[PDB]
Design an enzyme around this catalytic site. Structure first.
Site, PDB file in Angstrom:
ATOM      1  N   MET A  27       0.819  -1.206   0.000  1.00 32.30           N
ATOM      2  CA  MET A  27       0.000   0.000   0.000  1.00 32.30           C
ATOM      3  C   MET A  27       0.858   1.263   0.000  1.00 32.30           C
ATOM      4  SD  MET A  27      -1.402   0.552   3.856  1.00 32.30           S
ATOM      5  CE  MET A  27      -2.881  -0.388   3.488  1.00 32.30           C
ATOM      6  N   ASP A 138       6.896   1.084 -19.442  1.00 31.65           N
ATOM      7  CA  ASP A 138       5.507   1.159 -19.000  1.00 31.65           C
ATOM      8  C   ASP A 138       5.055   2.588 -18.724  1.00 31.65           C
ATOM      9  OD1 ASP A 138       2.984   0.150 -18.390  1.00 31.65           O
ATOM     10  OD2 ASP A 138       3.469  -0.155 -16.270  1.00 31.65           O
TER      11      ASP A 138
END
Ligand SMILES: OC[C@H](Cc1ccccc1)Nc1ncnc2[nH]cnc12
Length: 340
Positions: A27, A138
């Site tokens: 997270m 990416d």
């Protein structure tokens, strides 16, 4: 130490935690740096159960600790347990960024000026990355962190590779994936992604939103038209160049028809970036020199890599236990009592 029924354990230096948009491996949370008197972002990563997650974690750490550039997110600190046995989750401290281009596009149409200087900042950072012989692999709006219109940083170097045009044998975000990837490790794949991002800034939606890779190809050819014999012959993998063919022949949809309200210089640059043939596709120094960016282009204010990057050890075939050790070693500089 407690954040939404889960430990964070980033004390006592980093306090006043506040949950934000969580990542993939763990997270992400905001924090106050008691040392630097400022709020920062901390990325909790727990990659050790799976091999790939360990590659992406290690990949990002080596690259970002070496890179130093205004448009590339840095690494301020790495929080981790003293011994290898004890550590299951790694903490990475970065500058706090208010939002990203993905979020900004959901809420606002961008002006030509804002688009232009966003595009400049991306290419500026990309120039540094490519000068280091590194591919990002990416690029997409959500990987473009933003504070203001003058503060853009590229993030997420998990899929980053050292360039290797001769490397012939996991894949990037589909909508921003270059055609040569889907048909048959070059810098051209990054320019394509940027092109896709430029198109997206001009109309607040993805230009090639395929459901899967074949559909992704149909979308691309739907705008660029059916590829020439020249571009066709550079498709080395049969059942592609001889997959279609059958090819419900498509005409090149003119850029100015797709984006009637756009700067013609932007569409010209956009056109160079989204050329099917990778060998004819515009390069990063050329894109920066394109007239559309002439008010910002300044080679004397665009740093490049001191030394072309090379992984001291090549990671692709190594087990997850060997990766944890290499991660432990790379993050050792941020540990108390570090020598050498
Ligand atoms: O949209 C990206 C979020 C934006 C954000 C900032 C504060 C509260 C909520 C959302 N920031 C970051 N997200 C991931 N990694 C990072 N590194 C630095 N900043 C970020």
């Amino acid at each position: 130490e407690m954040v939404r029924g889960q430990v964070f354990d980033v004390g006592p230096r980093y306090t006043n935690l506040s949950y934000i948009g969580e990542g993939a491996y763990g997270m992400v949370c905001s924090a106050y740096d008691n040392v630097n008197k400022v709020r920062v972002a901390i990325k909790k990563i727990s990659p050790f159960e799976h091999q790939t997650y360990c590659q992406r974690t290690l990949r990002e750490i080596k690259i970002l600790l070496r890179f130093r550039h205004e448009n590339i997110i840095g690494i301020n600190d790495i929080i981790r347990a003293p011994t290898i046995e004890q550590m299951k989750d790694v903490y990475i401290v970065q500058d706090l960024m208010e939002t990203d281009l993905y979020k900004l596009l959901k809420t606002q149409h961008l002006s030509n000026d804002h688009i232009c200087y966003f595009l400049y900042q991306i290419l500026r950072g990309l120039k540094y990355i490519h000068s280091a012989n590194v591919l990002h692999r990416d690029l997409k709006p959500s990987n473009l962190l933003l504070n203001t219109t003058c503060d853009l940083k590229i993030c997420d170097f998990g899929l980053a590779r050292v360039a290797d045009p001769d490397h012939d044998h996991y894949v990037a975000t589909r909508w921003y994936r270059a055609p040569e990837i889907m048909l048959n490790y070059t810098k051209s794949i990054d320019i394509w992604s940027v092109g896709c991002i430029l198109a997206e800034m001009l109309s607040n939606r993805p230009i090639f939103p395929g459901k899967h890779y074949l559909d992704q190809l149909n979308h691309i050819l739907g705008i660029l038209g059916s590829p020439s014999q020249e571009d066709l012959n550079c498709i080395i993998n049969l059942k592609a160049r001889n997959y279609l063919l059958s090819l419900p022949h498509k005409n090149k949809v003119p850029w100015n028809r797709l984006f009637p309200n756009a700067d013609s210089k932007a569409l010209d640059l956009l056109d160079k970036m989204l050329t099917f043939n990778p060998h004819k596709r515009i390069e990063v120094e050329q894109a920066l020199a394109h007239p559309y960016l002439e008010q910002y282009y300044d080679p004397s204010d665009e740093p490049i890599a001191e030394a072309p990057f090379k992984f001291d050890m090549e990671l692709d075939d190594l087990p997850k236990e060997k990766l944890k050790e290499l991660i432990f070693e790379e993050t050792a500089r941020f540990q108390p009592g570090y020598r050498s």
